[PDB]
Tab-separated table of C-alpha atoms (C1' of nucleotides) in Angstrom:
chain	number	residue	atom	x	y	z
A	195	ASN	CA	-3.780	-19.571	34.087
A	196	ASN	CA	-0.268	-18.181	34.728
A	197	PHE	CA	-0.279	-14.625	36.106
A	198	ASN	CA	3.030	-14.786	37.976
A	199	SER	CA	5.255	-13.027	35.445
A	200	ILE	CA	5.925	-9.369	36.219
A	204	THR	CA	3.697	-13.771	29.016
A	205	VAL	CA	0.860	-14.534	26.624
A	206	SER	CA	0.379	-12.217	23.653
A	207	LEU	CA	-2.060	-11.746	20.809
A	208	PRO	CA	-1.415	-13.787	17.632
A	209	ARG	CA	0.585	-11.925	15.007
A	210	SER	CA	-1.008	-13.543	11.935
A	211	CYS	CA	-4.619	-14.607	11.155
A	212	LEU	CA	-5.200	-18.223	12.212
A	213	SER	CA	-7.802	-18.830	9.423
A	214	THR	CA	-5.044	-19.804	6.984
A	215	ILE	CA	-3.203	-22.296	9.200
A	216	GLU	CA	-6.528	-23.842	10.260
A	217	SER	CA	-7.644	-24.857	6.786
A	218	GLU	CA	-10.755	-26.233	8.420
A	219	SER	CA	-13.772	-25.997	6.118
A	220	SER	CA	-13.869	-26.900	2.439
A	221	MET	CA	-15.504	-23.570	1.564
A	222	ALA	CA	-13.236	-21.627	3.940
A	223	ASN	CA	-10.098	-22.306	1.902
A	224	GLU	CA	-12.184	-21.168	-1.084
A	225	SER	CA	-13.250	-17.903	0.545
A	226	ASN	CA	-9.547	-17.334	1.243
A	227	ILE	CA	-8.914	-16.888	-2.497
A	228	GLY	CA	-10.252	-14.640	-5.237
A	229	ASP	CA	-9.655	-10.969	-5.983
A	230	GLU	CA	-8.189	-11.925	-9.372
A	231	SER	CA	-4.692	-13.365	-8.639
A	232	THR	CA	-3.396	-12.731	-5.109
A	233	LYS	CA	-3.290	-14.273	-1.620
A	234	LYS	CA	-5.571	-13.098	1.225
A	235	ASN	CA	-3.406	-10.842	3.380
A	236	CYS	CA	-5.132	-9.752	6.611
A	237	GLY	CA	-2.230	-7.547	7.798
A	238	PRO	CA	0.646	-7.361	10.255
A	239	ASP	CA	-1.404	-7.663	13.544
A	240	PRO	CA	-5.237	-7.787	13.000
A	241	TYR	CA	-6.814	-8.974	16.324
A	242	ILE	CA	-9.265	-6.769	18.338
A	243	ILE	CA	-10.384	-7.694	21.891
B	195	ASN	CA	3.179	9.678	-20.882
B	196	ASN	CA	5.760	6.910	-21.484
B	197	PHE	CA	4.237	3.701	-22.872
B	198	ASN	CA	7.316	2.419	-24.701
B	199	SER	CA	8.537	-0.120	-22.148
B	200	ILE	CA	7.579	-3.712	-22.925
B	204	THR	CA	7.372	1.239	-15.737
B	205	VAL	CA	5.110	3.154	-13.378
B	206	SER	CA	3.643	1.277	-10.420
B	207	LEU	CA	1.203	1.908	-7.607
B	208	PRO	CA	2.624	3.481	-4.417
B	209	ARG	CA	3.596	0.947	-1.773
B	210	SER	CA	2.816	3.100	1.285
B	211	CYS	CA	0.005	5.616	2.023
B	212	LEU	CA	1.048	9.127	0.970
B	213	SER	CA	-1.074	10.802	3.729
B	214	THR	CA	1.805	10.501	6.204
B	215	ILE	CA	4.566	11.954	4.018
B	216	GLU	CA	2.242	14.777	2.923
B	217	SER	CA	1.628	16.181	6.386
B	218	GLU	CA	-0.569	18.757	4.717
B	219	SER	CA	-3.421	19.849	6.982
B	220	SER	CA	-3.166	20.714	10.661
B	221	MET	CA	-6.086	18.413	11.507
B	222	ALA	CA	-4.844	15.678	9.153
B	223	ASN	CA	-1.744	14.946	11.232
B	224	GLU	CA	-4.154	14.824	14.189
B	225	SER	CA	-6.500	12.330	12.537
B	226	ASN	CA	-3.393	10.223	11.882
B	227	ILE	CA	-3.061	9.558	15.628
B	228	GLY	CA	-5.268	8.110	18.345
B	229	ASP	CA	-6.317	4.542	19.088
B	230	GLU	CA	-4.625	4.783	22.498
B	231	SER	CA	-0.840	4.577	21.812
B	232	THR	CA	0.101	3.439	18.295
B	233	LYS	CA	0.903	4.775	14.813
B	234	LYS	CA	-1.627	4.688	11.936
B	235	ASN	CA	-0.615	1.716	9.802
B	236	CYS	CA	-2.603	1.465	6.546
B	237	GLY	CA	-0.916	-1.776	5.388
B	238	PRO	CA	1.629	-3.188	2.966
B	239	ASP	CA	-0.051	-2.042	-0.347
B	240	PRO	CA	-3.464	-0.279	0.151
B	241	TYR	CA	-4.335	1.461	-3.189
B	242	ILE	CA	-7.472	0.520	-5.239
B	243	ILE	CA	-8.041	1.826	-8.803
C	1	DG	C1'	-13.645	-57.975	-63.454
C	2	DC	C1'	-9.038	-56.321	-62.129
C	3	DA	C1'	-5.777	-52.471	-60.799
C	4	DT	C1'	-5.236	-48.058	-58.665
C	5	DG	C1'	-5.064	-43.764	-55.760
C	6	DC	C1'	-7.653	-41.056	-52.092
C	7	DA	C1'	-9.595	-40.374	-47.629
C	8	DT	C1'	-10.646	-42.534	-43.358
C	9	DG	C1'	-8.952	-44.064	-38.640
C	10	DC	C1'	-4.874	-46.279	-35.685
C	11	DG	C1'	-0.686	-45.782	-33.240
C	12	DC	C1'	3.273	-43.383	-31.901
C	13	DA	C1'	6.108	-39.272	-29.706
C	14	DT	C1'	6.391	-34.436	-28.354
C	15	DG	C1'	5.154	-30.089	-26.691
C	16	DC	C1'	2.329	-27.319	-23.684
C	17	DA	C1'	-1.013	-24.483	-20.414
C	18	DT	C1'	-2.025	-25.044	-15.279
C	19	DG	C1'	-0.512	-25.335	-10.594
C	20	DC	C1'	2.127	-25.554	-6.087
C	21	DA	C1'	6.195	-25.923	-2.755
C	22	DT	C1'	11.067	-24.498	-1.406
C	23	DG	C1'	15.479	-21.552	-0.447
C	24	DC	C1'	17.264	-17.352	-0.941
C	25	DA	C1'	17.055	-12.519	-0.591
C	26	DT	C1'	14.591	-8.247	-0.420
C	27	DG	C1'	12.333	-4.503	2.109
C	28	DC	C1'	10.081	-2.703	5.823
C	29	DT	C1'	9.420	-1.896	10.765
C	30	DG	C1'	9.258	-2.309	15.698
C	31	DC	C1'	12.817	-1.607	19.312
C	32	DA	C1'	16.598	0.527	22.020
C	33	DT	C1'	19.419	4.680	22.495
C	34	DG	C1'	20.273	9.392	23.379
C	35	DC	C1'	18.688	13.944	24.408
C	36	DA	C1'	15.987	18.726	24.845
C	37	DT	C1'	12.855	20.561	27.503
C	38	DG	C1'	10.006	22.736	31.306
C	39	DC	C1'	7.575	21.856	35.826
C	40	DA	C1'	7.965	20.501	40.491
C	41	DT	C1'	10.593	19.696	44.801
C	42	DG	C1'	13.245	19.921	49.029
C	43	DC	C1'	15.926	23.253	50.999
C	44	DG	C1'	18.419	27.038	53.890
C	45	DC	C1'	18.026	32.064	54.744
C	46	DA	C1'	15.900	36.691	55.613
C	47	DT	C1'	11.880	39.227	57.270
C	48	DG	C1'	7.795	40.354	60.241
C	49	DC	C1'	4.985	39.037	63.813
C	50	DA	C1'	3.507	37.235	68.527
C	51	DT	C1'	4.904	36.405	73.482
C	52	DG	C1'	6.978	37.425	77.242
C	53	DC	C1'	10.291	40.697	80.921
D	1	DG	C1'	9.384	49.841	76.057
D	2	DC	C1'	12.613	45.809	75.192
D	3	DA	C1'	14.381	40.859	74.009
D	4	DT	C1'	13.053	36.666	72.038
D	5	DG	C1'	11.189	32.708	69.219
D	6	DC	C1'	7.873	30.949	65.342
D	7	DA	C1'	5.461	31.314	60.895
D	8	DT	C1'	5.958	33.002	55.798
D	9	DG	C1'	8.101	34.186	51.677
D	10	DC	C1'	12.655	34.377	48.863
D	11	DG	C1'	16.327	32.106	46.606
D	12	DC	C1'	18.837	27.833	44.945
D	13	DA	C1'	19.799	23.507	42.998
D	14	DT	C1'	17.998	18.907	41.701
D	15	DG	C1'	15.051	15.285	39.833
D	16	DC	C1'	11.533	13.662	36.501
D	17	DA	C1'	7.216	13.050	33.613
D	18	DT	C1'	6.518	13.928	28.523
D	19	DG	C1'	8.076	13.595	23.888
D	20	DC	C1'	10.626	12.572	19.465
D	21	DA	C1'	14.487	11.145	16.160
D	22	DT	C1'	18.288	7.716	14.683
D	23	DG	C1'	21.156	3.283	13.935
D	24	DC	C1'	20.678	-1.295	14.304
D	25	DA	C1'	18.547	-5.434	14.162
D	26	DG	C1'	14.876	-8.903	13.931
D	27	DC	C1'	11.209	-10.455	10.963
D	28	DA	C1'	7.830	-11.659	7.623
D	29	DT	C1'	6.582	-11.153	2.631
D	30	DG	C1'	7.337	-11.649	-2.316
D	31	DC	C1'	10.174	-13.811	-5.797
D	32	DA	C1'	12.802	-17.374	-8.678
D	33	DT	C1'	13.518	-22.521	-9.716
D	34	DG	C1'	12.045	-26.739	-10.256
D	35	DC	C1'	9.110	-30.168	-11.063
D	36	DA	C1'	4.565	-33.247	-11.577
D	37	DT	C1'	0.688	-33.610	-14.289
D	38	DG	C1'	-2.662	-34.380	-18.022
D	39	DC	C1'	-4.036	-32.580	-22.465
D	40	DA	C1'	-3.340	-31.640	-27.421
D	41	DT	C1'	-0.308	-31.875	-31.527
D	42	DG	C1'	1.088	-33.807	-35.952
D	43	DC	C1'	2.868	-37.375	-37.902
D	44	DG	C1'	3.561	-41.945	-40.621
D	45	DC	C1'	0.847	-46.365	-41.328
D	46	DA	C1'	-3.031	-49.568	-42.338
D	47	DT	C1'	-7.646	-50.161	-44.074
D	48	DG	C1'	-11.952	-49.427	-46.934
D	49	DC	C1'	-13.733	-47.000	-50.677
D	50	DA	C1'	-14.386	-44.718	-55.406
D	51	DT	C1'	-12.369	-44.487	-60.087
D	52	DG	C1'	-10.213	-45.984	-64.197
D	53	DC	C1'	-9.166	-49.504	-67.504
DNA sequence: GCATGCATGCGCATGCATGCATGCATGCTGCATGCATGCATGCGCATGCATGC
DNA sequence: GCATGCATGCGCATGCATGCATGCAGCATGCATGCATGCATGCGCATGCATGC
Protein backbone atom coordinates (compact mmCIF):
# COMPACT_ATOMS: atom_id res chain seq x y z
CA ASN A 1 0.00 0.00 0.00
CA ASN A 2 2.96 2.32 -0.73
CA PHE A 3 3.55 2.88 -4.46
CA ASN A 4 5.18 6.31 -4.21
CA SER A 5 8.83 5.28 -4.53
CA ILE A 6 10.29 5.73 -8.00
CA THR A 7 10.51 -0.67 -2.07
CA VAL A 8 9.18 -4.10 -1.19
CA SER A 9 11.11 -7.12 -2.45
CA LEU A 10 10.77 -10.88 -2.47
CA PRO A 11 12.12 -12.76 0.58
CA ARG A 12 15.67 -14.00 0.16
CA SER A 13 15.35 -17.14 2.32
CA CYS A 14 12.50 -19.68 2.78
CA LEU A 15 10.21 -18.61 5.63
CA SER A 16 9.32 -22.26 6.54
CA THR A 17 12.36 -22.48 8.83
CA ILE A 18 11.81 -19.26 10.79
CA GLU A 19 8.10 -20.09 11.15
CA SER A 20 8.58 -23.37 12.99
CA GLU A 21 4.81 -23.63 13.05
CA SER A 22 3.65 -27.25 12.94
CA SER A 23 5.08 -30.13 14.96
CA MET A 24 5.42 -32.28 11.83
CA ALA A 25 6.74 -29.36 9.75
CA ASN A 26 9.98 -29.09 11.72
CA GLU A 27 10.22 -32.87 11.20
CA SER A 28 9.75 -32.67 7.43
CA ASN A 29 12.54 -30.06 7.48
CA ILE A 30 15.05 -32.78 8.43
CA GLY A 31 16.17 -36.09 6.97
CA ASP A 32 18.33 -36.91 3.97
CA GLU A 33 20.83 -38.65 6.27
CA SER A 34 22.70 -35.83 8.11
CA THR A 35 22.21 -32.34 6.65
CA LYS A 36 20.01 -29.24 6.94
CA LYS A 37 17.22 -28.44 4.44
CA ASN A 38 18.67 -25.81 2.12
CA CYS A 39 16.10 -24.37 -0.31
CA GLY A 40 18.60 -22.08 -2.11
CA PRO A 41 19.72 -18.48 -2.47
CA ASP A 42 16.36 -16.97 -3.71
CA PRO A 43 13.56 -19.59 -4.24
CA TYR A 44 10.24 -17.64 -4.57
CA ILE A 45 8.10 -17.77 -7.79
CA ILE A 46 5.12 -15.41 -8.34
CA ASN B 1 43.31 -44.67 -7.38
CA ASN B 2 44.65 -43.25 -4.08
CA PHE B 3 42.98 -44.75 -1.00
CA ASN B 4 45.85 -44.25 1.44
CA SER B 5 44.63 -41.11 3.20
CA ILE B 6 42.97 -41.74 6.55
CA THR B 7 41.03 -36.83 -0.41
CA VAL B 8 38.76 -36.53 -3.43
CA SER B 9 35.46 -34.71 -2.99
CA LEU B 10 32.36 -33.94 -5.01
CA PRO B 11 32.47 -30.80 -7.20
CA ARG B 12 31.01 -27.73 -5.53
CA SER B 13 29.66 -26.05 -8.68
CA CYS B 14 27.98 -27.45 -11.84
CA LEU B 15 30.60 -28.24 -14.50
CA SER B 16 28.16 -27.49 -17.40
CA THR B 17 29.10 -23.80 -17.32
CA ILE B 18 32.88 -24.19 -17.35
CA GLU B 19 32.61 -26.84 -20.08
CA SER B 20 30.92 -24.62 -22.64
CA GLU B 21 30.94 -27.62 -24.94
CA SER B 22 27.96 -27.60 -27.30
CA SER B 23 26.65 -24.63 -29.24
CA MET B 24 23.09 -25.28 -28.03
CA ALA B 25 24.25 -26.04 -24.48
CA ASN B 26 25.41 -22.47 -23.82
CA GLU B 27 21.99 -21.46 -25.20
CA SER B 28 20.06 -23.76 -22.86
CA ASN B 29 22.08 -22.18 -20.04
CA ILE B 30 20.24 -18.87 -20.59
CA GLY B 31 16.63 -17.74 -20.62
CA ASP B 32 14.14 -17.20 -17.81
CA GLU B 33 13.87 -13.52 -18.78
CA SER B 34 17.13 -11.87 -17.56
CA THR B 35 19.21 -13.98 -15.15
CA LYS B 36 22.05 -16.52 -15.07
CA LYS B 37 21.44 -20.28 -14.59
CA ASN B 38 22.23 -20.96 -10.94
CA CYS B 39 22.18 -24.68 -10.07
CA GLY B 40 22.92 -24.15 -6.34
CA PRO B 41 25.62 -24.42 -3.70
CA ASP B 42 26.35 -28.22 -4.03
CA PRO B 43 24.04 -30.05 -6.55
CA TYR B 44 25.64 -33.50 -7.24
CA ILE B 45 23.84 -36.81 -6.38
CA ILE B 46 25.63 -40.20 -6.53
C1' DG C 1 26.70 -78.24 65.21
C1' DC C 2 30.28 -74.78 64.24
C1' DA C 3 33.59 -72.43 60.96
C1' DT C 4 34.55 -71.07 56.32
C1' DG C 5 34.80 -69.29 51.45
C1' DC C 6 31.91 -68.24 47.20
C1' DA C 7 28.41 -65.88 44.69
C1' DT C 8 24.68 -62.72 45.05
C1' DG C 9 23.13 -57.71 45.28
C1' DC C 10 24.08 -52.66 47.22
C1' DG C 11 26.36 -48.36 46.86
C1' DC C 12 29.69 -45.38 45.06
C1' DA C 13 32.32 -42.61 41.17
C1' DT C 14 33.62 -42.10 36.34
C1' DG C 15 33.39 -42.13 31.53
C1' DC C 16 30.67 -41.76 27.39
C1' DA C 17 27.43 -41.49 22.99
C1' DT C 18 23.89 -37.85 21.60
C1' DG C 19 22.65 -33.17 20.66
C1' DC C 20 22.42 -28.00 19.95
C1' DA C 21 23.85 -22.92 20.07
C1' DT C 22 27.54 -19.26 19.36
C1' DG C 23 31.62 -16.40 17.29
C1' DC C 24 34.79 -16.41 13.97
C1' DA C 25 36.20 -16.99 9.36
C1' DT C 26 35.71 -18.92 4.85
C1' DG C 27 34.02 -18.75 0.09
C1' DC C 28 31.05 -17.34 -3.27
C1' DT C 29 28.37 -13.87 -5.77
C1' DG C 30 25.65 -9.93 -7.05
C1' DC C 31 26.92 -5.09 -8.12
C1' DA C 32 29.34 -1.06 -10.16
C1' DT C 33 32.83 0.31 -13.53
C1' DG C 34 34.77 0.79 -17.97
C1' DC C 35 34.65 0.01 -22.83
C1' DA C 36 34.02 -1.92 -27.96
C1' DT C 37 30.90 -1.86 -31.19
C1' DG C 38 27.55 -0.77 -35.05
C1' DC C 39 23.07 1.60 -36.24
C1' DA C 40 20.57 5.78 -36.44
C1' DT C 41 20.22 10.88 -36.55
C1' DG C 42 20.30 15.77 -37.58
C1' DC C 43 22.64 18.39 -40.71
C1' DG C 44 24.55 21.57 -44.61
C1' DC C 45 25.63 21.26 -49.59
C1' DA C 46 25.19 20.03 -54.59
C1' DT C 47 22.11 18.67 -58.33
C1' DG C 48 17.82 18.54 -61.22
C1' DC C 49 13.35 20.00 -61.78
C1' DA C 50 9.19 23.21 -61.99
C1' DT C 51 7.54 28.13 -62.55
C1' DG C 52 7.68 32.19 -64.28
C1' DC C 53 9.66 36.55 -67.78
C1' DG D 1 14.65 30.72 -74.79
C1' DC D 2 16.18 32.50 -70.11
C1' DA D 3 16.37 33.32 -64.79
C1' DT D 4 14.79 31.61 -60.57
C1' DG D 5 13.28 28.87 -56.40
C1' DC D 6 11.95 24.12 -54.22
C1' DA D 7 12.38 19.10 -53.62
C1' DT D 8 15.91 15.03 -53.39
C1' DG D 9 20.08 12.77 -52.67
C1' DC D 10 25.14 13.09 -50.95
C1' DG D 11 28.34 13.73 -47.33
C1' DC D 12 29.60 14.49 -42.31
C1' DA D 13 29.76 14.14 -37.49
C1' DT D 14 27.32 12.76 -33.22
C1' DG D 15 24.61 10.12 -29.91
C1' DC D 16 22.90 5.67 -28.08
C1' DA D 17 20.70 0.96 -27.49
C1' DT D 18 22.99 -3.67 -26.78
C1' DG D 19 26.40 -6.45 -24.62
C1' DC D 20 30.24 -8.38 -21.68
C1' DA D 21 34.41 -8.61 -18.45
C1' DT D 22 36.90 -7.09 -14.00
C1' DG D 23 37.94 -5.36 -9.06
C1' DC D 24 35.73 -4.64 -5.07
C1' DA D 25 32.62 -5.35 -1.67
C1' DG D 26 28.58 -7.12 0.80
C1' DC D 27 26.60 -11.37 2.42
C1' DA D 28 25.15 -15.82 3.89
C1' DT D 29 26.82 -20.62 4.80
C1' DG D 30 29.69 -24.09 7.04
C1' DC D 31 32.88 -24.93 10.78
C1' DA D 32 35.09 -25.20 15.57
C1' DT D 33 34.31 -24.83 20.80
C1' DG D 34 31.90 -25.47 24.54
C1' DC D 35 28.74 -27.28 27.33
C1' DA D 36 24.29 -29.84 29.35
C1' DT D 37 22.44 -34.19 29.74
C1' DG D 38 21.37 -39.00 30.96
C1' DC D 39 23.14 -43.64 30.46
C1' DA D 40 26.49 -47.37 31.37
C1' DT D 41 30.83 -48.89 33.59
C1' DG D 42 33.43 -51.35 37.12
C1' DC D 43 34.51 -51.35 41.42
C1' DG D 44 34.76 -52.44 46.66
C1' DC D 45 31.37 -53.90 50.38
C1' DA D 46 27.65 -56.45 52.82
C1' DT D 47 24.65 -60.40 52.95
C1' DG D 48 22.94 -65.29 52.29
C1' DC D 49 24.26 -69.69 50.90
C1' DA D 50 26.91 -74.22 50.21
C1' DT D 51 30.91 -76.86 51.97
C1' DG D 52 34.11 -78.70 55.15
C1' DC D 53 35.31 -80.22 59.70
